[PDB]
């Protein structure tokens, strides 16, 4: 299909946003880990 190069882009764009949505839920806790690491190194 000659739609396929188009929908492939739209779908990968939405997958990027799906990953962003899941990373947003975890990065606050990555940050907490980084802050405790910096506490430990003081």
């Amino acid at each position: 299909s000659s739609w396929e190069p188009l929908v492939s882009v739209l779908e990968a764009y939405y997958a990027g946003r799906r990953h962003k949505k899941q990373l947003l839920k975890k990065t606050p806790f990555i940050i907490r880990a980084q802050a405790h690491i910096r506490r430990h190194l003081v």
Binding site: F29, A33, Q34
Partner: protein, 145 residues
């Protein structure tokens, strides 16, 4: 404004806080950066978001009362082992419980508030013995008081 303050009293003893503050206090004030260091030394784990919000609203030079407020805002009573471990387990595709050294480095130096290579190299000299790292064990170490 109160759960931060309750948590401060059950997480730090005020004698120690006052002693440290006056250790580095020059005329009853300390810089926000030195406040970050003092809060770490009192056993709390402020983030740089904490620091920048606090100085956004209260300025750059803290008297003891504003320092007390800042330390209050850095108590993070909601911290717990399971959430830190899920942070790391996000990248552990099989959830078996291990990350490699390269994974730990890239995660810690790429996301959130990335560590400098110096920060990470010190951390790793201590904890990243192997190439396979048990990140639940590492998170409990990191959370010990």
């Amino acid at each position: 404004d109160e759960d931060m303050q309750e948590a401060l009293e059950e997480m730090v003893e005020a004698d120690e806080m006052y002693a440290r503050f006056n250790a580095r206090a020059s005329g009853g004030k300390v810089s926000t950066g030195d406040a970050m260091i003092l809060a770490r030394q009192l056993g709390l784990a402020p983030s740089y978001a904490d620091k920048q919000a606090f100085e956004e609203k209260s300025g750059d030079n803290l008297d003891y009362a504003s320092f007390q407020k800042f330390v209050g805002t850095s108590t993070h009573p909601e911290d717990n082992i399971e959430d830190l471990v899920e942070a790391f387990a996000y990248f552990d595709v099989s959830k078996h419980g291990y990350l490699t050294r390269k994974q730990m480095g890239n995660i810690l130096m790429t996301y959130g508030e990335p560590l400098t290579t110096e920060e990470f190299n010190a951390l790793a000299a201590e904890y990243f013995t192997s190439d396979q790292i048990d990140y639940r064990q590492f998170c409990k170490a990191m959370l010990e008081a």
